[PDB]
Structure formats: structure tokens, C-alpha cells
Amino acid sequence: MKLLHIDSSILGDNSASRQLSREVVEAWKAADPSVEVVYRDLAADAIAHFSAATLVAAGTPEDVRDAAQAFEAKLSAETLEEFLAADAVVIGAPMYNFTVPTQLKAWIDRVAVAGKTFRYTEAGPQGLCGNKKVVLVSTAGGLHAGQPTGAGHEDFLKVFLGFIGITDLEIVRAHGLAYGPEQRSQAIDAAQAQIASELF
Amino acid sequence: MKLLHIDSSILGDNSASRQLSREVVEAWKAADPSVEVVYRDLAADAIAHFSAATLVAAGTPEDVRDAAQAFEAKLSAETLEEFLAADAVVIGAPMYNFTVPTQLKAWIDRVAVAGKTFRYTEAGPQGLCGNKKVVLVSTAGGLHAGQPTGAGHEDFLKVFLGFIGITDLEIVRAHGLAYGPEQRSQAIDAAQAQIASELF
Ligand SMILES: Cc1cc2nc3c(=O)[nH]c(=O)nc-3n(C[C@H](O)[C@H](O)[C@H](O)COP(=O)(O)O)c2cc1C
Ligand SMILES: Cc1cc2nc3c(=O)[nH]c(=O)nc-3n(C[C@H](O)[C@H](O)[C@H](O)COP(=O)(O)O)c2cc1C
């Protein structure tokens, strides 16, 4: 099966979510050596804001698109196709300014596509991604899960994933990382324990 | 006083939030002809993703910055300064894929600045923007305020605004816009009634 490994942290080697997302993927490869991994670093190679141009490009026939429109259309196509092909997705999801990074939301905007990851039916919208397994690697400076301050982060992500039909979701969490070295170390240690004994 | 008018819709003349944000500002000008308006269309002139480069530029002395770093630093400075100067802010805030547009969040990332719009104290973080009035123009295809599906939209915005100390907040809402022409028309009519009789 195909595993898509997504990072969105802007903090590079100092990133908690990049460390933990890599650790989930390493654990996964060890548990299933046949897994095929595709990597996408949404911070290193940022996806353009979903724009009026994105919409115009989508509604313009390929043979009449200019270069900028071909760019937007290919960006939309390649991102969507990579997600559709994936059987499992590991997503690094920092909390920056009370929500996810715009680098991550820009990816979400390309994968939330009517007719592909969800569809409209006479009975209402139906998610089409129910076969996909997702591991969300959720990292934050504070501890606000289950509280209003956390609305834009895990709650939002759960809404999006639920809408496209994901039912098989695990959250690997390391929160309170800004409260000092000992608290940061334990939060990461606990997340590693989840990876080691509660994922596979 | 200085009013900052922000739009983030990608739908141009078909935008509900651009129509209503303009109507709030027109009403404001009529109520207070001395108000000075500054406009920023975050969709037409999109702010770069808040990135590793943004952080590096901020920590690099001006005299050693290269051109790309001067760009990031000026973008950060001009956006922040415009917000600090504003006494009132009218913000067009569509719901796209269960949250705000990345164009709007990229602005939030430049205005959430320690020491400027909030500060760390020995007693915890304190918002510094309590004198500012904000009118949020909230538009959505569905009706999900007060429900989990709405977490990434108004709930998130209220968290951000509360953190930087905004207490004087009004929300002008037009939701259910995707459910048909009559429902869209009434939602906009109700929002116009709020503007006419419940804002000023
Ligand atoms: C630009 C920026 C914004 C942040 N905003 C928040 C925030 O709103 N709430 C919070 O709890 N932590 C916040 N943090 C702390 C991060 O959530 C924390 O450092 C986490 O480890 C980020 O994941 P990462 O290390 O993989 O980048 C922010 C950090 C940065 C760099
Ligand atoms: C790319 C895109 C994504 C959208 N996602 C949502 C959504 O998640 N939930 C919703 O209720 N409406 C959604 N809508 C509908 C918009 O919220 C609605 O059209 C609203 O009027 C947008 O504000 P605007 O007209 O100022 O652009 C979406 C519209 C677009 C174009």
C-alpha cells in the first residue's frame, strides 16, 4: 500500500511534528516493509493560495490555458492525484496562530474536490475517502485540546477529515511544548510511546 | 479615526463578503464622515505564506538582509503597522473548506506579533488591541455556526481576536448561501438589516 507522508512545519530540524511524523513513518515501514512512501514537504515546496486564478484555470480548457493557468491546473491535479492514490496519510500538523499552517490548508484546498474526495448526492454530501487511514501528528506550544482555544486546530482537522469520509483516524499528540524543556521532553516521550505500542 | 477594510474572498463581484464588507464601510462613512479608510484586498494582493524565510528575515539585521529577506521583513512590517494604526477593522471572512481563506490566515500570521499586538507577562499573555473595534463579515454556504462543523471559521476567529485583546466585536453574518436563491437573498437581506439598525 501507498503511504503519503506530509509535513507542514516551518521549523525544520527544530520541528516536533517533523520528528514525530518521520517516526510514525519509520515505525510503519518496520511493521510493513512493503509499504511504498511518497513524501511531500508543504513548507519546503509551498502550494499557492487557492485563488480566483485557480478557479478560472479549472474552468478553462487545457488547449486554451496560458502558462500560469497550466501551472494552477497541474498543481491541482498532481496534489489531488497523489492523495487519491494514497492508502494511508501521515500528516504533520503544527498549531500556528490558533490553527494549522497556511501551507497545510493550501493542501486541503486542493484535495477537497467535489466528485473526487466527496460527492454531492440527492441525500447530501458523501465522503469518498473511507478506505484511507490517517495519522495526524498534532503539535502545539500550549495545551488547548478540548477547549475553545483549540477550535481552529484539531477540531477543524477532524471536521475536514470527517467530511471527506475518513473514519480510521489516529492522533499522535505532543502539546505543551512551549512550557519548558521537561514538559516538552515528556510530551514527545508520550507521543513516542503511542507510536511504539498504540498504533501498530 | 482610521478604519482598515480587509477583504479575503476569491469570488470577486460574486462575493457575499465583499458586498457586505463594502456596505458596512459605506454605512460607517455615512455615520462618521471623518473616518479615514484604508483598503487591503488580501485575495488580489496575497500575502506570502508565513515561512522559515519569514522567521530568518526577522532575525537578520537589515544591513545584512538579501532582497528576498528585505521583502519578507517589509511585508511583515507594513502589514503589522497598518493594523496597529487602525482603530476599527472590517474583515471579510468567507468559509472555504471549513475555515477561513489562507489569504486571511496569512494576514493573521503577520499581525499576531509578540510585543506589538499581544505581550508575554509574568502573569501570562495579554492582548494589546483592546481599543480596536472589529466587524467580522462572516459568509458561508451552509449553516454551521454553533456546531462542530463551524470550529475552523467563526470559533477560530473569535479565539484569535480574543487573544490579541479585542473586546468590541460585531459579527455580520450571511450563512446558508448555497441552499438556493431565496435562502441566499434572505440571508443577505438580514445582514443588511443588521448593518442598517444594529451596528451604528
Ligand atoms: C509562527 C508560530 C505560531 C505559533 N502559534 C501557536 C499558537 O497559536 N498556539 C500554540 O499553542 N502554539 C503556537 N506555536 C507553537 C507551536 O505550536 C509549537 O512550536 C509546535 O511545536 C509547532 O510544531 P512544529 O515544531 O512541528 O513546527 C506557534 C509557533 C510558531 C512558530
Ligand atoms: C473554495 C470554496 C470552498 C468553500 N467551502 C465551504 C465550506 O467548507 N463550508 C461552507 O459552508 N461553504 C463553503 N463554501 C461556500 C462559501 O462559504 C460561500 O460561497 C460564501 O459566500 C463565500 O464567501 P464569499 O462569497 O465572500 O467568497 C466554499 C466556497 C468556495 C469557493
Q: What is the C-alpha to C-alpha distance for residues B182 and A11, in angstroms, rounded to an integer? A: 48
Q: What is the C-alpha to C-alpha distance for residues B51 and B57, in angstroms, rounded to an integer? A: 10
Is residue B141 within 8 Å of B153, Cβ to Cβ? no
Which of B42, B80, B105 is the best mutation test for A, with the most CBs of A within 10 A?
Answer: B105
Q: What is the C-alpha to C-alpha distance for residues B166 and B168, in angstroms, rounded to an integer? A: 6
List the single residue in A46, A51, A151 with the smallest CB-CB distance to B159: A151
List of chain B residues whose C-beta atoms are within 8 Å of the C-beta of residue A159: 98, 148-149, 151-152
List the single residue in A99, A106, A112 with the smallest CB-CB distance to B156: A99
Is residue B158 within 8 Å of B100, Cβ to Cβ? no
Dihedral (CA of A91, A97, A98, A102) sign: negative
Is residue B118 within 8 Å of B159, Cβ to Cβ? no
Is residue B117 within 8 Å of B129, Cβ to Cβ? yes
List of chain A residues whose C-beta atoms are within 8 Å of the C-beta of residue B154: none
Is residue A159 within 8 Å of B149, Cβ to Cβ? yes
- Provide the strand spans (E) within chain B: 2-7, 36-41, 88-94, 118-121, 124-127, 133-139, 168-174
Place of cell 497550466: A70
Distances B111 to B12, B86, B104, B114 between C-alpha atoms, Å:
24, 12, 11, 9
Terminal C-alpha separation, chain B: 15
Residue B36 neighbours by CB under 8 Å, 6+ apart: B1, B2, B3
Asked if the Cβ–Cβ distance from A97 to B106 is below 8 Å, we say no
- Grid coordinates in use for A8? 507542514
Is residue A38 within 8 Å of A5, Cβ to Cβ? yes
What are B90's strand-pairing partners? Answer: B5, B135
Q: What is the C-alpha to C-alpha distance for residues B91 and B5, in angstroms, rounded to an integer? A: 6
CA distance B145 to chain A (A): 12
Dihedral (CA of B114, B118, B119, B125) sign: negative
Cβ count within 10 A of residue A95 = 23
- CA triplet B7, B158, B156: central angle to 5 degrees? 80
Q: B192: part of which helix (H) or strand (E)?
A: helix B181-198
Ramachandran region, residue A165 (left: φ > 0; alpha: ψ -120 to 50; beta: rest): left
Is residue A3 within 8 Å of A86, Cβ to Cβ? yes
Helix count and strand count (H, E) for chain A:
6, 7
Q: Tell me, what DSSP letter sits at residue A96?
A: B
Q: What is the C-alpha to C-alpha distance for residues B85 and B17, in angstroms, rounded to an integer? A: 23
Residue B11, ligand 2, Cβ within 6 A: yes
Q: Which residue, among B199, B200, B198, B186, has the nearest Cα to B16 in the 3D structure? A: B186
Asked if the Cβ–Cβ distance from B50 to A159 is below 8 Å, we say no
Task: Annotate A49-65 with b (16+ C-beta within 10 A) or e (fewer).
Answer: bbbeebeebeeeeeeeb
Cβ count within 10 A of residue A81 = 12
Q: What is the C-alpha to C-alpha distance for residues B153 and B139, in angstroms, rounded to an integer? A: 10
Pinpoint the alpha helices (H) of B34-101.
52-58, 67-85
3-state secondary structure B109-132: HHHCCECCCEEEECCEEEECCCCC
What are A39's strand-pairing partners? Answer: A5
Is residue B88 within 8 Å of B134, Cβ to Cβ? yes
Helix count and strand count (H, E) for chain B:
6, 7
Q: Which residue, among A84, A85, A5, has the nearest Cα to A44 in the 3D structure? A: A5
- Grid coordinates in use for B86? 487602525
List the single residue in A98, A102, A158 with the smallest CB-CB distance to B49: A102
Asked if the Cβ–Cβ distance from B55 to A102 is below 8 Å, we say no
Residue B98, ligand 2, Cβ within 6 A: yes
Q: What is the resolution of this structure in A?
A: 1.6
What is the distance in A from the centroid of ligand 2 to the CA of A131? 27
Cβ count within 10 A of residue B197 = 8
Cβ count within 10 A of residue A189 = 11
Is residue B10 within 8 Å of B45, Cβ to Cβ? no
C-alpha radius of gyration, chain A, whole number: 18
Q: What is the C-alpha to C-alpha distance for residues B25 and B3, in angstroms, rounded to an integer? A: 8
Domains and CATH numbers, chain B: 1-200 (3.40.50.360)
Chain-centroid distance, C-alpha A4 = 9
Cβ count within 10 A of residue B109 = 23
Q: Which residue, among A23, A3, A15, A37, has the nearest Cα to A194 in the 3D structure? A: A23
- CB burial of residue B89 (10 Å; 0-12, 13-18, 19+): buried
Place of cell 497523489: A82
Q: What is the C-alpha to C-alpha distance for residues A67 and A60, in angstroms, rounded to an integer? A: 12
Nearest-atom number in ligand 1 for the CA of A14 is 25
Is residue A22 within 8 Å of A91, Cβ to Cβ? no
Question: Quick one: angle between helices B181-198 and B16-31, nearest 10?
Answer: 20
Is residue B25 within 8 Å of B38, Cβ to Cβ? no
Pinpoint the alpha helices (H) of chain A.
16-31, 52-58, 67-85, 102-111, 156-163, 181-198
3-state secondary structure of A4: strand
Question: Quick one: angle between helices A67-85 and A102-111, nearest 10?
Answer: 80
Distances A15 to A8, A97, A135, A140 between C-alpha atoms, Å:
10, 16, 17, 11
What are A5's strand-pairing partners? Answer: A39, A90
Q: What is the C-alpha to C-alpha distance for residues B60 and A70, in angstroms, rounded to an integer? A: 36
